[PDB]
């Protein structure tokens, strides 16, 4: 229904401000009841929550492990959705995903998020 | 918070049941009466999908080959009949308190 | 059995009646309409909106002479002006003093908002009235959507119900409806072609995805002024605006008989007008005889507290002796009273209480419990609040004193 | 494409901070026919991402300012909301003009145009600036989504595309035309409309007395619930005392954005 | 609408037709609705002295 | 306001002039809803 | 003391230059009950001494802009006269919504709110902008003082104090409450009112005739001086020729802000 893709660079030079984007194709960003997330998968560590933002009344909620260095944004003119992260480490190599939520008419939308972007590999390296 | 997923893997016997367990530090049950648990399915080469949210609530476009239940922190997924296409990894998933941490992975094959 | 009764077309009220054949036991009927629609037949004529004056680019020739190419846009104008944009300090960089030539073409098209900011022009006829009923016949609880055409029956449990025609055949929906912003108006909209500039109908498309636009906007072109290239014109303001700011209030605010005009499948709900008959075809199975129902003996009524209000003011206390401690359908054959219930539960040798809306200050109504005709009689005190928030629960047969 | 192929232009504006001339910031179109003050503009200058900038045409060369230096005003100042293509979305109040202006190193550029910007309040309490709080009705406001909804406007080559404007002429070599989408179409939604103070309702024998104390102009709509409705529409600003007769057939009224209340008399 | 006995009393009779209302999601705020004041309205609709 | 997340409140009567006190169920109905509450309903506000 | 002890807060504004937000320059209270256009605001910033500046709360931290970059307007611009605490004293004209705003490195942060800001002229010659020269009447204008006269508002700890706004919730640890003074109270004073153009009084037998030529809407107040005085009170904006019958008893004539004159006839 609502296809999502993802984009952004790869080998960001270490100890720097990394960044990626995410565009929701054929779908709404200003809508309520859908919040949009960011996810990584490091080697062996497993999947991870980073943060999200609500569509309407878009105030964000990050993870305190990297609240000092993480940043999520939004651009309604292009229906886009993005992530910025200062001071990359070495083991942050990951296949970034961006995801939409299910229609949050209940308290279950916390975690049960739906249609994905196919992924963007990110190898912090030289 | 962090939570332990057990076993690390369980490949055996297509055409039989199966189940996985998940133990969480603090209870994932809230004052409003809701077990904030999710189970993600991940086939190889695709992004995660879901089977059972809320501890016992199936998804919409899901097959009926599943079930799940639990108490407080000792939670249990139960696959009713393994098929061939079900190869992948299963994840226990948490929601009741930030940071929303996920499971460590349980790999299933034949 | 055939019973032919009449229900006032009024939502929320429970019509509690009975059917008693010659020697079998009473059967209570309790039918309560929740919603009573009035659905007209709508044939679209057009859908109009704002307009947007398209302005084709000028065709300029220096020391030239153009010819207007006929095009067939809506309200397509086309002129040619000579002596326009003179010397190179003129805006068009022509060399000439006169005999520079401009062609200024224009048209009208629908706004880029007409796909979701538009007004629909409907013609109407042939209301198809339709009710929702909450029904209890012989201790049942069926809800049913009934067409109150006189021929669309509902099959309840062994009993076929046919909810009459309606009189009068009234509608607020005049022959010419307009639909806009979720509200209905009764405007005398002109047809696909009789539109005039400055009133509702300067733009007429048969649908919002047609290509047969009609624009009578009075677009008169004009001559330019030297200094820079432009296409002037004078044009009439949209009558869409002028209707939007000088239309009367809607029909939900101005319809009689207390209707409620709603735009979805187009309708008027809850017109408190008239009365619909009801024809039953009751079988004999769920129509048990007296041999199992409690049989009364020595029933005496007393009216305790009567206030002739529009609600369930009156109380009736009946002292009885009957065989079984069970149920009895209760009813008043006359319109001198109206009861909160259709059947009351009696003990063996006890008393019972009934609440009833009432009427003229001296009630004397033939109250009926399972088979008896007791005659409650009393005097009523006047009421306490002479403005209320609900309609009447009785009949007012003008026999006060 | 999206877009990377178009070009802005110079054109006639009446006023340009010294009389008339060709302006980079002309205004081809203004639309102000939504509810809560949104206006859409269509100019002779573009808006893009390289972040929200304004690429204008000037004597052949092409320029670029941001969109915090731009300033448009009608009778009070406006607040731009977004820009895309030749178009611009703002929150402007009522006036009889739209002026627009900015300033490079030393010169100020301007363009004013007579268009009747109008504030079209939702509901039955005619306000001028929206309320801090209130009930929620259905509104249509020039939206912020810039997707392709179905609306298109024309343009052509004369190396780059240019709008098929009344203020530019047409080429004779080849009329290579094309169409590009208008963002910020008028779409539905839910907007916040003020709620008038509670009417005071004194009773009387087959009569009601309404004492009304409004903060702003408000519609009182009364009718009888009978065969002869006698609909009374009024706009009320002053504190008023209106007495109505109320039968057994019924009487209802509506005070501003409140629901309809039904009163019924008795003996 | 406000009736205080002296200018430094402790009581004031306030019959303002104040009615609270339900807020909208988005942020914390106490909504209300009440009458325009009567001091102002009298001040502007008073006869000459 | 007096807010409680997944709560249920009760009004404490003070005797101010024209003291109106009420309670609202269903606000602010999520996180990212304004009160940083976890809940969809039974977030309770007391206005005074 | 205030600026060394308190903390501002973020709060809800309707129009934060893009819809709503949590604005630091939110307006909890406006007052314009004075005569000559003095308004008083109660923001969610502060105004101290370290020289007159503005300290605001922006996502936990604290900031500082001077009070020469702030700008507020209603329909025309305003002119801040002073700032103290959470309160601000300005000279704003009649409008319908106050809009305050400031600009940091790139963000123009604003807040607008609907309030019937009004200009209540002094006396009997209705001016919209005060006069260059004229006679001197009594006026209740917001004072430039900031001393403690007796007007207090409440506040609380949640390390620092914060106003007891309705747009922030209530703590649960301890309601350690206190009060702080409202400056910019409404004090008496002398203000300058226009003096109307002189009338031409053509006598006549038991009748006065008045040719009037108002510079601005001016009140004409007449009364006879018998048991039946016939007080007339009409506003005039156009030039007028008003004739009044005048007995041996009395005719008191008052033209705007002039002294009350008296004429009565003789046989």
What's this structure's resolution in Å? 3.6
Question: Among residues D114, D115, D139, which one has the least CA distance to residue D127?
Answer: D139
Question: Among residues A72, A92, A95, A69, which one has the least CA distance to residue A82?
Answer: A72
Tokens of D9: 């232009």
Sequence-distant contacts of G236-243: CB under 8 A, at least 24 apart? G236/G212, G238/G214, G239/G211, G239/G212, G239/G213, G239/G214, G240/G210, G240/G211, G240/G212, G241/G209, G241/G210, G241/G211, G241/G212, G242/G209, G242/G210, G242/G212, G243/G204, G243/G207, G243/G208, G243/G209, G243/G210
What is the CB neighbour count within 10 angstroms for residue C207?
Answer: 11
> Which of D47, D83, D147, D190 to substitute to test the interface with A, most A CBs within 10 Å?
D147
Question: Among residues G40, G42, G44, G26, which one has the least CA distance to residue G99?
Answer: G26
Question: Among residues G185, G175, G218, G184, which one has the least CA distance to residue G199?
Answer: G218
How far is Cα C300 from Cα C372, in angstroms, rounded to an integer?
10
Using CA of residue A113, residue A119, residue A124, residue B3, what is the dihedral sign?
A: positive
How far is Cα A108 from Cα B58, in angstroms, rounded to an integer?
12
How far is Cα B26 from Cα C150, in angstroms, rounded to an integer?
66
CB contact under 8 A, G170 and F1: yes
E strands present in C111-188: 119-125, 130-137, 142-147, 154-155, 160-162, 176-180, 183-185
> Which of C185, C253, C270, C307 to substitute to test the interface with D, most D CBs within 10 Å?
C253
C243 in helix, strand or coil?
helix
C137 in helix, strand or coil?
strand
Question: Among residues B73, B74, B77, which one has the least CA distance to residue B86?
Answer: B77
D107 in helix, strand or coil?
coil
Strands B37-42 and B34-35: unpaired
List, in order, residues 6 or more apart from G150 with CB less than 8 Å away. none
Tokens of D150: 């179905």
Which residues from chain G sit within 8 angstroms of residue D131, using beta carbons? 14, 114
How far is Cα G46 from Cα G240, in angstroms, rounded to an integer?
52
How far is Cα D255 from Cα A60, in angstroms, rounded to an integer?
40
> Which of A102, A107, A109, A110 to substitute to test the interface with F, most F CBs within 10 Å?
A107
CA D230 to chain CA centroid, Å, is: 35
Please tell me if residue B58 touches chain A, with a CB cutoff of 8 Å: no
CB contact under 8 A, D49 and A30: no
CB contact under 8 A, G96 and D130: no
Strands G232-236 and G261-262: unpaired
CB contact under 8 A, D144 and A78: no
Q: Work out the end-to-end distance of chain D between its first and last CA atoms, rounded to an integer number of angstroms.
A: 75
Cβ(G199)–Cβ(G172) under 8 Å?
no
C222 in helix, strand or coil?
coil
CB contact under 8 A, D185 and C227: no
The domain total for chain B is: 1
How far is Cα G42 from Cα G28, in angstroms, rounded to an integer?
6
Strand partners, C318: C301, C352
Question: Among residues C185, C40, C217, C38, which one has the least CA distance to residue C121?
Answer: C185
How far is Cα C299 from Cα C302, in angstroms, rounded to an integer?
10
> Which of F31, F32, F38 to substitute to test the interface with B, most B CBs within 10 Å?
F38
Q: Domains in chain A and their CATH numbers? A: 4-122 (2.60.40.10)
C240 in helix, strand or coil?
helix
Question: What does DSSP assign to residue D259?
Answer: P
Which residues from chain F sit within 8 angstroms of residue B30, using beta carbons? 6, 38
Tokens of C24: 């079998």
CB contact under 8 A, E33 and D132: no
Rounded-to-10 torsion of CA G55, G57, G58, G62: 60
Question: Among residues G32, G38, G34, G72, which one has the least CA distance to residue G54?
Answer: G72
Q: Helix (H) and strand (E) counts for chain F?
A: 0, 3
Label residue C6 left, alpha or beta by phi (over 0 means left) and psi (-120 to 50 means alpha).
beta
Technique behind the model: cryo-EM
Tell me which residue in G106, G110, G114 faces D79 most closely, judged by beta carbons: G110
Which backbone phi and psi does A6 adopt, to 5 degrees? -150, 155
G97 vs chain D: nearest CA distance in angstroms? 7
CB contact under 8 A, A59 and F32: yes
Tokens of B35: 């077990």
Helix (H) or strand (E) holding G202: strand G200-204
Please tell me if residue B94 touches chain A, with a CB cutoff of 8 Å: yes
Helix (H) or strand (E) holding G199: none
CB contact under 8 A, F32 and A54: yes
Rounded-to-10 torsion of CA D127, D132, D137, D143: 90
Q: Work out the end-to-end distance of chain G between its first and last CA atoms, rounded to an integer number of angstroms.
A: 73
How far is Cα G215 from Cα G196, in angstroms, rounded to an integer?
7
Which residues from chain B sit within 8 angstroms of residue F6, using beta carbons? 30-32
How far is Cα G35 from Cα G125, in angstroms, rounded to an integer?
13
Distances (CA, A) of F23 to F9, F18, F42: 7, 16, 11
How far is Cα A122 from Cα A20, in angstroms, rounded to an integer?
10
D88 in helix, strand or coil?
strand
Which residues from chain D sit within 8 angstroms of residue A78, using beta carbons? 49, 146
List, in order, residues 6 or more apart from F37 with CB less than 8 Å away. F3, F5, F6, F28, F29, F30, F31, F43
Tokens of F30: 């999520």
Cβ(C378)–Cβ(C318) under 8 Å?
no
Tell me which residue in C60, C115, C230 faces D166 most closely, judged by beta carbons: C230
Tokens of D246: 């109320």
Tokens of C61: 């020739």
List, in order, residues 6 or more apart from D261 with CB less than 8 Å away. D252, D253, D254, D255
G114 vs chain E: nearest CA distance in angstroms? 14
Please tell me if residue D149 touches chain E, with a CB cutoff of 8 Å: no
Which backbone phi and psi does C240 adopt, to 5 degrees? -60, -50
Which residues from chain B sit within 8 angstroms of residue A65, using beta carbons? 99
How far is Cα G81 from Cα G68, in angstroms, rounded to an integer?
11
How many F/G residue pairs have CB atoms within 8 Å?
A: 9
Question: What does DSSP assign to residue G164?
Answer: -
Closest E-chain CA to D211: E35
> Which of A77, A79, A80, A82 to substitute to test the interface with D, most D CBs within 10 Å?
A77
Tell me, letter by letter, the H, E, C secondary structure of chain E. CEECCCCCCCCCEECCCCEECCCCCCCCCCCEECCCCHHHHHHHCCCCC
CB contact under 8 A, B95 and A110: yes
Q: Is F37 exposed, middle or buried (0-12, 13-18, 19+ CB in 10 A)?
A: buried
Tokens of F36: 């940083």
Chain A contacts to B (CB-CB under 8 A): 46-49, 61, 63-65, 97, 99, 107-108, 110-112, 116-119
Cβ(G183)–Cβ(G152) under 8 Å?
no
How far is Cα F7 from Cα B56, in angstroms, rounded to an integer?
25
Cβ(D221)–Cβ(D231) under 8 Å?
yes
Distances (CA, A) of G206 to C143, G229, G233, G263: 88, 16, 21, 10
CATH of the domain at B13: 2.60.40.10
How far is Cα C179 from Cα C187, in angstroms, rounded to an integer?
10
List, in order, residues 6 or more apart from B46 with CB less than 8 Å away. none
Only one residue has tokens 């008896």, namely C372
How far is Cα C54 from Cα C62, in angstroms, rounded to an integer?
25
How far is Cα D240 from Cα D224, in angstroms, rounded to an integer?
20
How far is Cα B81 from Cα C306, in angstroms, rounded to an integer?
72
How far is Cα C256 from Cα D265, in angstroms, rounded to an integer?
18
- The CA-based angle C47-C53-C56, given to 5 degrees, is 130
Which residues from chain B sit within 8 angstroms of residue A46, using beta carbons? 91, 102-105
Q: Is G257 exposed, middle or buried (0-12, 13-18, 19+ CB in 10 A)?
A: buried
Q: Which residues in chain D (69-108) have CB-CB distances under 8 A to chain C?
A: none
Which residues from chain G sit within 8 angstroms of residue F3, using beta carbons? 169-170
**Could you list the residue range(s) of the whole structural domain that residue B11 is in?**
3-108
Question: What does DSSP assign to residue A75?
Answer: B
Tell me which residue in E23, E34, E35 faces D133 most closely, judged by beta carbons: E23
Question: Among residues B47, B43, B22, which one has the least CA distance to residue B103?
Answer: B22
CB contact under 8 A, D132 and E29: yes
Q: Alpha helices, DSSP H only, in C135-238?
A: none
Which backbone phi and psi does E39 adopt, to 5 degrees? -65, -50
List, in order, residues 6 or more apart from C128 with CB less than 8 Å away. C39, C40, C41, C147, C149
A partners (3+ CB pairs within 8 A) are: B, D, F
Which residues from chain B sit within 8 angstroms of residue F42, using beta carbons? 32
Using CA of residue D139, residue D144, residue D148, residue D152, what is the dihedral sign?
A: positive
Cβ(D186)–Cβ(D163) under 8 Å?
no
Which residues from chain A sit within 8 angstroms of residue F31, using beta carbons? 61
- The CA-based angle D94-D95-D100, given to 5 degrees, is 110
Total length of chain D: 267
F partners (3+ CB pairs within 8 A) are: A, B, E, G
Q: Which residues in chain B (22-61) have CB-CB distances under 8 A to chain F?
A: 30-32
After which residue numbers is chain G interrupted with C–N beyond 2.5 angstroms? 50, 158
A24 vs chain B: nearest CA distance in angstroms? 16
Cβ(C194)–Cβ(C204) under 8 Å?
no
CA F35 to chain CA centroid, Å, is: 10
How far is Cα D39 from Cα D113, in angstroms, rounded to an integer?
14
Please tell me if residue D213 touches chain E, with a CB cutoff of 8 Å: yes
Closest F-chain CA to A61: F32
List, in order, residues 6 or more apart from G165 with CB less than 8 Å away. G9, G11, G28, G44
How far is Cα D225 from Cα D231, in angstroms, rounded to an integer?
10
What is the CB neighbour count within 10 angstroms for residue C302?
Answer: 13
What is the CB neighbour count within 10 angstroms for residue D151?
Answer: 19
> Which of B48, B57, B107 to substitute to test the interface with A, most A CBs within 10 Å?
B48
């Amino acid at each position: 229904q609502v296809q999502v893709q993802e984009s952004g660079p790869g080998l960001v030079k270490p100890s720097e401000t990394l960044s990626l984007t995410c565009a929701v194709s054929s779908g709404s960003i200003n809508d309520d009841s859908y919040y949009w997330t960011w996810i990584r998968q490091s080697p062996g560590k497993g999947l991870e929550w980073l943060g999200f933002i609500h569509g309407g009344t878009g105030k964000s909620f990050y993870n305190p492990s990297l609240e000092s260095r993480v940043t999520i944004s939004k651009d309604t003119s292009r229906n886009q959705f993005s992530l910025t992260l200062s001071s990359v480490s070495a083991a942050d190599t990951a296949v970034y995903y961006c995801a939409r939520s299910h229609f949050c008419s209940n308290t279950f939308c916390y975690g049960w998020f739906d249609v994905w972007g196919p992924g963007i590999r990110v190898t912090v390296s030289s | 918070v962090v939570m332990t997923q057990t076993p690390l893997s369980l490949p055996i016997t297509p055409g039989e049941p199966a189940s996985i367990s998940c133990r969480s530090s603090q209870s994932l049950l809230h004052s409003n009466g809701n077990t904030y648990l999710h189970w993600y399915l991940q086939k190889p080469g695709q992004s995660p999908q879901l089977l059972i949210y809320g501890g016992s609530n199936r998804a919409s476009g899901v097959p009926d080959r599943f079930s799940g239940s639990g108490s407080g922190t000792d939670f249990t997924l139960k696959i009713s009949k393994v098929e061939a296409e079900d190869v992948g990894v299963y994840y226990c998933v948490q929601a009741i308190a930030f940071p929303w941490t996920f499971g460590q992975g349980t790999k299933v094959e034949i | 059995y055939e019973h032919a009764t009449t229900m006032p077309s009024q939502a929320g009220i429970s019509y509690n009646t009975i059917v008693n054949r010659a020697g079998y036991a009473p059967l209570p009927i309790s039918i309560t309409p929740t919603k009573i629609k009035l659905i007209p037949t709508v044939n679209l004529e057009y859908v109009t909106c704002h307009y947007k004056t398209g302005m084709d680019s000028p065709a300029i020739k220096c020391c030239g002479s153009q010819e207007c190419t006929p095009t067939y846009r809506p309200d397509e104008q086309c002129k040619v002006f000579t002596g326009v944009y003179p010397f190179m300090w003129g805006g068009a960089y022509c060399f000439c003093d006169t005999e520079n030539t401009q062609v200024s073409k224009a048209y009208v098209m629908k706004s880029d908002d007409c796909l979701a900011d538009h007004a629909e022009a409907y013609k109407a006829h042939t209301a198809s009235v339709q009710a929702f009923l909450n029904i209890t016949v012989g201790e049942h609880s069926i809800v049913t959507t009934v067409y109150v055409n006189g021929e669309t029956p509902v099959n309840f449990n062994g009993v076929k119900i046919t909810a009459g025609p309606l009189s009068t055949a009234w509608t607020p929906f005049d022959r010419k409806i307009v639909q806009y912003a979720g509200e209905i108006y009764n405007y005398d909209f002109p047809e696909y072609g009789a539109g005039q500039p400055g009133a509702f109908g300067d733009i007429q498309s048969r649908t919002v995805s047609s290509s047969d636009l009609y624009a009578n906007t009075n677009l008169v072109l004009q001559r330019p002024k030297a200094g820079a290239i432009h296409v002037p014109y004078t044009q009439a303001p949209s009558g869409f605006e002028q209707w939007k700011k000088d239309k009367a209030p809607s029909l939900k605010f101005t319809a009689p008989f207390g209707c409620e005009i709603y735009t979805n499948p187009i309708r008027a709900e809850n017109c408190a007008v008239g009365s619909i008959p009801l024809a039953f075809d009751i079988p004999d199975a769920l129509f048990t005889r007296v041999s199992e129902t409690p049989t009364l003996s020595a029933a005496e009524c007393t009216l305790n507290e009567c206030v002739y209000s529009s609600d369930f003011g009156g109380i009736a206390t009946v002292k009885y002796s009957a065989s079984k401690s069970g149920k009895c359908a209760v009813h008043v054959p006359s319109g001198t009273a109206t009861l909160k219930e259709a059947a009351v539960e009696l003990t063996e040798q006890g008393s019972a209480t009934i609440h009833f809306s009432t009427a003229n200050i001296h009630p004397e109504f033939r109250l009926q419990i399972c088979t008896s005709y007791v005659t409650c009689k009393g005097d009523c005190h006047p009421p306490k609040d002479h403005i209320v928030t609900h309609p009447q629960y009785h009949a007012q047969t003008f026999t006060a004193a | 494409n999206e877009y990377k192929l178009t070009r802005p232009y110079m054109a006639r504006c009446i006023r340009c901070a010294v009389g008339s001339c060709h302006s980079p910031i002309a205004i081809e179109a203004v639309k102000s026919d939504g509810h809560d003050g949104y206006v859409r503009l269509q100019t002779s200058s573009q808006y893009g991402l390289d972040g929200r900038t304004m690429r204008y045409d000037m004597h052949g060369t092409i320029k670029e300012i941001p969109l915090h230096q731009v300033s448009l005003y009608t009778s009070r100042p406006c607040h731009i909301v977004d820009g895309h293509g030749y178009f611009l979305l703002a929150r402007c109040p009522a006036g009889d003009s739209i002026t627009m202006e900015f300033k490079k190193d030393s010169v100020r550029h301007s363009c004013s145009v007579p268009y009747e910007v109008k504030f079209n309040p939702v509901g039955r309490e005619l306000y001028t600036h929206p309320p801090e709080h209130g009930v929620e009705q259905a509104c249509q406001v020039y939206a912020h989504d810039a997707q392709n909804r179905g609306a298109y406007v024309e343009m052509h080559l004369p190396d780059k595309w240019v709008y098929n404007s009344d203020k530019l002429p047409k080429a004779a070599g080849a009329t290579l035309k094309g169409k590009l989408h208008v963002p910020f179409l008028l779409a539905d939604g839910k907007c916040t409309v003020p709620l008038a103070p509670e009417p005071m309702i004194t009773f009387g024998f087959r009569s009601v007395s309404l004492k009304l104390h409004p903060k702003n102009p408000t519609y009182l709509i009364t009718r009888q619930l009978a065969d002869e409705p006698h609909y009374t529409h009024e706009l009320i600003s002053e504190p008023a005392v209106r007495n109505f007769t109320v039968t057994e057939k019924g009487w209802e009224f509506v005070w501003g954005n409140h629901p309809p209340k039904r009163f019924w008399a008795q003996e």
